[PDB]
Amino acid sequence: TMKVINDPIHGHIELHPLLVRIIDTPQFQRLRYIKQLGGGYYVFPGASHNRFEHSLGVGYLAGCLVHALGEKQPELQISERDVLCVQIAGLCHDLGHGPFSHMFDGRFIPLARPEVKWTHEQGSVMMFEHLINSNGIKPVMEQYGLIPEEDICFIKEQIVGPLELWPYKGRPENKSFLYEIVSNKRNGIDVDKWDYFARDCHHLGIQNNFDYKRFIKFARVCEVDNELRICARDKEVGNLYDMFHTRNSLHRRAYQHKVGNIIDTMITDAFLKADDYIEITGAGGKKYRISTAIDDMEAYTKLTDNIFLEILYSTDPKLKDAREILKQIEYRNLFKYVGETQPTGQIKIKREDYESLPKEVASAKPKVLLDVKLKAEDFIVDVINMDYGMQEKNPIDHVSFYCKTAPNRAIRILPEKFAEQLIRVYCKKVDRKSLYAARQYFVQWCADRNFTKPQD
Amino acid sequence: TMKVINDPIHGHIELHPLLVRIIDTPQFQRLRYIKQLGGGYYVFPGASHNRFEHSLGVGYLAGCLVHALGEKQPELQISERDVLCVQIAGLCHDLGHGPFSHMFDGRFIPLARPEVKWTHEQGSVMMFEHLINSNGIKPVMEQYGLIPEEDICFIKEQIVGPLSLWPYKGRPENKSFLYEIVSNKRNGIDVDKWDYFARDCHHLGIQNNFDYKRFIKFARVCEVDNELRICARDKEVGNLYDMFHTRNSLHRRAYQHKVGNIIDTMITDAFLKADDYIEITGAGGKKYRISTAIDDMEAYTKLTDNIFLEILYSTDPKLKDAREILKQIEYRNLFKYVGETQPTGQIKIKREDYESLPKEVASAKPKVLLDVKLKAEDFIVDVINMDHVSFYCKTAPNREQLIRVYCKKVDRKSLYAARQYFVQWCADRNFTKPQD
Ligand SMILES: [Ca+2]
Ligand SMILES: [Ca+2]
Ligand SMILES: [Fe+3]
Ligand SMILES: [Fe+3]
Numbered sequence: 001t002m003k004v005i006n007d008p009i010h011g012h013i014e015l016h017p018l019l020v021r022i023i024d025t026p027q028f029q030r031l032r033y034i035k036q037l038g039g040g041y042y043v044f045p046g047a048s049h050n051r052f053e054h055s056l057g058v059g060y061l062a063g064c065l066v067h068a069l070g071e072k073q074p075e076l077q078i079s080e081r082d083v084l085c086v087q088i089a090g091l092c093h094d095l096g097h098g099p100f101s102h103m104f105d106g107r108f109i110p111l112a113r114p115e116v117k118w119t120h121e122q123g124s125v126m127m128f129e130h131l132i133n134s135n136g137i138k139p140v141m142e143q144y145g146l147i148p149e150e151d152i153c154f155i156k157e158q159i160v161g162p163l164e165l166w167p168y169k170g171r172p173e174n175k176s177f178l179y180e181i182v183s184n185k186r187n188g189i190d191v192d193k194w195d196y197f198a199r200d201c202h203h204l205g206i207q208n209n210f211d212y213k214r215f216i217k218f219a220r221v222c223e224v225d226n227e228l229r230i231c232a233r234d235k236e237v238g239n240l241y242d243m244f245h246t247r248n249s250l251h252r253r254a255y256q257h258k259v260g261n262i263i264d265t266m267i268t269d270a271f272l273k274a275d276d277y278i279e280i281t282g283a284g285g286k287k288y289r290i291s292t293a294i295d296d297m298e299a300y301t302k303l304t305d306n307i308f309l310e311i312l313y314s315t316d317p318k319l320k321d322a323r324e325i326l327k328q329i330e331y332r333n334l335f336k337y338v339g340e341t342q343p344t345g346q347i348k349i350k351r352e353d354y355e356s357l358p359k360e361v362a363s364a365k366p367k368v369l370l371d372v373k374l375k376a377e378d379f380i381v382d383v384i385n386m387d388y389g390m391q392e393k394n395p396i397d398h399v400s401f402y403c404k405t406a407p408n409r410a411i412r413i414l415p416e417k418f419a420e421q422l423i424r425v426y427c428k429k430v431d432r433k434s435l436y437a438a439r440q441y442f443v444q445w446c447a448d449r450n451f452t453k454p455q456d
Numbered sequence: 457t458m459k460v461i462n463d464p465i466h467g468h469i470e471l472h473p474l475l476v477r478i479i480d481t482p483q484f485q486r487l488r489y490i491k492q493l494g495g496g497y498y499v500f501p502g503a504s505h506n507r508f509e510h511s512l513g514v515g516y517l518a519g520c521l522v523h524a525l526g527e528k529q530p531e532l533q534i535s536e537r538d539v540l541c542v543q544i545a546g547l548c549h550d551l552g553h554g555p556f557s558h559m560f561d562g563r564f565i566p567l568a569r570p571e572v573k574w575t576h577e578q579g580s581v582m583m584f585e586h587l588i589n590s591n592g593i594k595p596v597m598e599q600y601g602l603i604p605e606e607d608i609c610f611i612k613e614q615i616v617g618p619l620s621l622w623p624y625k626g627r628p629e630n631k632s633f634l635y636e637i638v639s640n641k642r643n644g645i646d647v648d649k650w651d652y653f654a655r656d657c658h659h660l661g662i663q664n665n666f667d668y669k670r671f672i673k674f675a676r677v678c679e680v681d682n683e684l685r686i687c688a689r690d691k692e693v694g695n696l697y698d699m700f701h702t703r704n705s706l707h708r709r710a711y712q713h714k715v716g717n718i719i720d721t722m723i724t725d726a727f728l729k730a731d732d733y734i735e736i737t738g739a740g741g742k743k744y745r746i747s748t749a750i751d752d753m754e755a756y757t758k759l760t761d762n763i764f765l766e767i768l769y770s771t772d773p774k775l776k777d778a779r780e781i782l783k784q785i786e787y788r789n790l791f792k793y794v795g796e797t798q799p800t801g802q803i804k805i806k807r808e809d810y811e812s813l814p815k816e817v818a819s820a821k822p823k824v825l826l827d828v829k830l831k832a833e834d835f836i837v838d839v840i841n842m843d844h845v846s847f848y849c850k851t852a853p854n855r856e857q858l859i860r861v862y863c864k865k866v867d868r869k870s871l872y873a874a875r876q877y878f879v880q881w882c883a884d885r886n887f888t889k890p891q892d
Contacts, residue, residue: 008659042488052501
């Protein structure tokens with residue numbers, strides 16, 4: 001038969017042999033050493049889960065959804081090849097994640113290389129191609145009825161989106177709903193977001209109220225404005241609300257934790273101080289930095305969380321400055337929270353301007369002059385985005401439902417409005433004179449940047 | 457005021473500032489990089505938890521039990537300092553675990569240094585002393601009412617044991633029940649096992665039936681043969697049997713997994729071929745081997761699961777042989793399972809003769825000659841090791857080894873060969889006939 005995996009969130013998981021061949025690969029097993037939340041592990045002891053089990057769950061849920069729609073609506077012409085293609089897309093959607101997951105692409109790369117526009121989804125596509133190329137997956141695809149020329153393009157489009165009128169080339173327009181499963185761009189609701197909602201809740205002691213298996217059993221494909229979309233049963237709006245609340249509770253209590261995000265900036269600070277002295281060997285023996293390893297998948301395969309311990313256990317004097325910061329984490333001698341603000345009604349801060357932010361705070365002009373002159377090297381500016389690629393909107397407005405009487409047409413038509421971006425400032429000095437001075441600079445920068453007034 | 461932890465098993469737990477000082481320590485944060493189940497992670501994806509979260513739970517449960525006894529029995533004179541000592545003891549009981557937990561002291565060390573005797577508890581006390589000294593914890597202990605002379609001895613004794621008559625020095629026999637909490641050496645029912653019963657079930661998807669909370673609630677200390685022992689209520693024996701079934705289920709389905717133990721042996725083998733070339737920095741620039749890092753505690757502090765990846769990501773030609781085996785874990789090209797047996801007598805194979813076992817199998821002469829001759833290196837033999845609880849009346853509140861053999865050759869001929877060797881080796885060691 002085929003492999004069975006006992007997941008603590010989904011139960012028994014059945015693995016097609018093609019999936020097994022993709023998993024038993026250094027590019028996929030790489031995800032065993034990538035913390036799902038990263039710095040959150042040092043705040044929540046149960047947050048020890050890695051990207052490996054998350055990807056296994058996303059592929060399982062993607063196959064469950066596509067198989068349910070096929071067996072419930074034969075008119076959709078869903079093939080078993082389409083089921084496996086969606087499963088692979090769910091398995092390999094997080095292949096491009098770097099050390100400590102969103103810390104790498106969200107903060108480190110913008111700080112070390114602000115000129116490059118890099119996302120972990122781009123790396124997922126590059127790592128997928130490197131995976132199939134380095135392990136002879138294409139003949140195994142042909143074994144199981146797949147056509148690599150268009151199916152691999154279909155998988156990549158499911159992971160990253162269109163590759164620059166129907167813009168997708170992997171599947172015709174009459175199967176547009178297949179592009180809404182692994183990563184939905186219309187509303188953000190997808191099986192990928194469902195897996196870590198349950199996984200993170202399971203690992204942090206927060207309660208999950210969204211029954212995702214109930215949602216799959218009532219998911220149907222329907223015609224909405226001449227477009228085939230995956231619709232929900234009307235009697236599932238209460239489950240939908242519970243899903244929204246569960247994501248906000250995770251954001252308010254875990255993702256935006258004030259100490260966990262500090263630790264993320266400290267790990268980023270150590271990585272930045274160590275970027276000039278670590279060497280990762282790529283294809284042809286070429287030495288790559290931590291920041292430049294994203295240009296070479298052969299080197300990026302060797303870039304996991306152990307570079308944290310490589311720096312911590314290093315004896316090189318060149319790495320001492322970076323080693324000291326990591327030692328500070330073990331002693332809980334963390335950076336000091338100065339304050340928090342928010343760009344309500346303002347244009348959100350972009351990744352390419354992260355590097356200029358601490359120099360902008362140190363350049364503030366407080367009225368009350370103090371005997372403590374602070375430099376930009378004493379300030380850390382943290383930008384926390386609940387979704388960097390999103391604009392303020394209610395997702396229910398982009399969710400379509402169906403009735404039991406009209407199971408092919410949608411319906412013409414308490415939720416917590418959520419902040420998107422939070423600006424936190426930390427100081428590296430620990431003395432009360434500098435710590436109070438940094439607070440003065442920060443409140444002055446909040447009026448200049450036209451951000452909300454800091455309270456405390 | 458004290459720090460609060462959100463734990464998936466126990467919920468919100470409060471940490472005394474002394475405990476926090478011990479936690480904020482590289483000697484203790486080392487536990488963040490030590491898989492609890494080791495090779496079991498490569499079979500169960502949810503088993504990503506480390507020893508750090510488990511130690512926190514044991515330190516919490518031990519304090520809960522002592523506090524519950526003191527509150528429910530003000531005659532025991534259990535002081536807040538007695539509570540802290542038990543909390544620290546459970547918090548530091550596993551400080552001596554090496555890479556991938558029990559495969560380091562249970563297989564690797566006996567294979568690399570068969571002459572040395574080493575256990576993770578005997579290393580946990582060394583870790584505790586090094587932890588206390590390197591961080592100046594004794595003054596912090598005193599400022600919270602802890603006297604270091606008696607207490608350090610107390611904490612060490614309820615971890616490793618006494619170092620005819622009452623052999624403990626940290627507490628008198630009047631507080632003997634305190635030594636039965638973190639690790640019981642009589643029947644084997646401690647809060648340590650309670651924590652990783654629920655925690656492992658929670659991460660493996662295995663159903664946990666024991667409720668440690670309702671047990672602790674109805675737990676009291678009674679007199680058994682003129683001695684004070686922890687006893688349970690007469691109607692809470694259903695919880696006791698659910699504990700025993702959860703243990704049996706965890707061993708049968710998780711701790712004794714086929715592929716899981718094969719991965720452990722494969723990781724041991726790569727460590728053995730990487731032992732002569734990996735350098736661990738120790739006390740004052742000195743260099744130790746992976747097998748010799750246990751002699752220096754500062755070198756052991758830097759011995760974690762990261763060794764697995766320094767071998768994997770290495771480019772040293774001397775490390776090529778070890779790097780090959782770790783890569784075969786990623787490609788799922790594992791050792792083939794040959795057979796399984798157990799000793800017929802009460803005698804049990806110790807660790808000083810683990811490396812002699814594969815050659816014994818290869819030295820066997822099967823009764824029928826065959827084509828493939830097998831070397832000792834082609835065999836892997838790992839050893840898997842595994843009613844007496846007091847109670848009280850509600851009215852009157854008082855009064856073994858398993859042997860598995862694997863083959864590194866994975867072809868039809870060599871596997872038939874290995875089975876013939878294994879059957880013959882079981883025959884002249886008087887072991888149970890292998891099930892076909
Ligand atoms: Ca992703
Ligand atoms: Ca133990
Ligand atoms: Fe994901
Ligand atoms: Fe333990």
